[PDB]
Amino acid sequence: MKKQEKLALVESALEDFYGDQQFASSLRESVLYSIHAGGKRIRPFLLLEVLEALQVTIKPAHAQVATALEMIHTGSLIHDDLPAMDDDDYRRGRLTNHKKFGEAMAILAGDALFLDSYALIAQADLPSQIKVDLIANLSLASGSLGMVAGQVLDMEGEHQHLSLEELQTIHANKTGKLLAYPFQAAAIIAELSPEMQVKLKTVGELIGLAFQVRDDVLDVTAKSTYPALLGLEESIAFCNQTLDQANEKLEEIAQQLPFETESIVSVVESLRIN
Amino acid sequence: SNAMKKQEKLALVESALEDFYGDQQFASSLRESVLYSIHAGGKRIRPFLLLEVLEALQVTIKPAHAQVATALEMIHTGSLIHDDLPAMDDDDYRRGRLTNHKKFGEAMAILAGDALFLDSYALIAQADLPSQIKVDLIANLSLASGSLGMVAGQVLDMEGEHQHLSLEELQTIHANKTGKLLAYPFQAAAIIAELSPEMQVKLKTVGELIGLAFQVRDDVLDVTASAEKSTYPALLGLEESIAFCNQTLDQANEKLEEIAQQLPFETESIVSVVESLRIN
């Protein structure tokens, strides 16, 4: 239904930007490979769902904002797999970008996604100031004050005695920022109050936290991980109790402004373990 | 003094570069790695052209203008960090200085370049400029840097190795790898000055011509002042490459004066940069 109509809009905006205007044939092929590498597209899907939950009719300009989010996320996965980083030959059961196209092509494919991402927001049919705030917050969540900082601290944390709070700070930047951005991006597009934006951003941070804990307890069922530090059973409790807090903040938001939460709660419950 | 005023303009960009990568940074190694490639010196011709064309259009330079020029140099600096990686050009030194991946490691250089790419547009979005001007500045900067510009040029240049290309293929490589980011300061200045859409493409054409001769001059200097990449002297000869370079710079001056006949323009700052590239 709309779940596939929403994902079809994101896929179309992805293929249109990397389509008829592309002249570097190898760069387009490398970019589309990691785009087609798979995934539920949880980050661009959440943006369209929170926006539709905010009673905003979904339009292609919104899907293009969601596309810019997933291009940055896809670019980070390409660089993470590089031999100098995590050195992964396969990701999600599929051959990685550098293993198929070479290291230099994977570097440039991620660079193109990073530099091209903001173009989709700037080219979308949206008010200019809304596009400025969407761009400024996407850079804040992705650059040296967010995702990239989280990638540096995570790599350095492997040779340090870190607390769980410090590891949570690392994950909140490396992964939580781009998982919380679809909530604050929808809030900006819906032109919500600044107090409502931080309350929606808090919901995205909670879902991003449980998404991190869920991935750790799933990587073992398939050193500084949640099932290694806390343990397997209590990490599942911490994952589900965080999803309960997300449902509380969602229902609380639903009492202050019109906000149909059933679609968002459905995605929250899809992350719950047993 | 123009050399002083050039130092003063680049001091504004240098100051903006250190504030963004300063106290607000919490990744210690990321700030240190980024500032290292920033502190590697450089002619800074790309942010300098933005502020110089802006001054020549009778526009008083403001900090918001320097932050736009800062964003441009951040993307260019990030491309150099990735160019020096072993998987790319594999350079231990540029300008006689140790490269970023040699001092901090490959992973740190990769992320330092990624940060510069992703942070660049933030300085345009946070500057004191009208919202639509920021949108046009950001859209054109991405157009010149991503899969339709710089990165595409790096791909075609890498794949052109050990290959004998035609001149239209070499021009396509250079126009994208270096040409578009060299022409962006002209287009960015026309947008900030609120010029007509015609005067925007006229200023852009001058930047494209200057960026074309800038690359041809480097190909000549790499041979005169000395893998298998095709160069301008390798396809036309070292003499025609000089003729094509100076003839291209002559076309820029002719266009620069033509622009002055239609618009309040002080062309002698830009003509000077044109003549600084003239081979003898």
UniProtKB/TrEMBL annotation, chain B:
Q: Which residues form a coiled coil?
A: 235-269
Transmembrane stretches in the record are none
Might you give the EC number(s) for this enzyme? Answer: 2.5.1.10
Keywords annotated in UniProt: Coiled coil, Isoprene biosynthesis, Magnesium, Metal-binding, Transferase
Q: Which GO terms describe its molecular function?
A: (2E,6E)-farnesyl diphosphate synthase activity; metal ion binding
Fetch the PROSITE patterns from UniProt: POLYPRENYL_SYNTHASE_1, POLYPRENYL_SYNTHASE_2
Q: Name one GO biological process term.
A: terpenoid biosynthetic process
Establish whether keyword Coiled coil is in the entry: yes
Q: Which family does it belong to?
A: Belongs to the FPP/GGPP synthase family.
Q: Name the chain's protein.
A: Farnesyl diphosphate synthase
Record the organism.
Streptococcus pneumoniae serotype 4 (strain ATCC BAA-334 / TIGR4)
Q: What is the lineage of its organism?
A: Bacteria, Bacillati, Bacillota, Bacilli, Lactobacillales
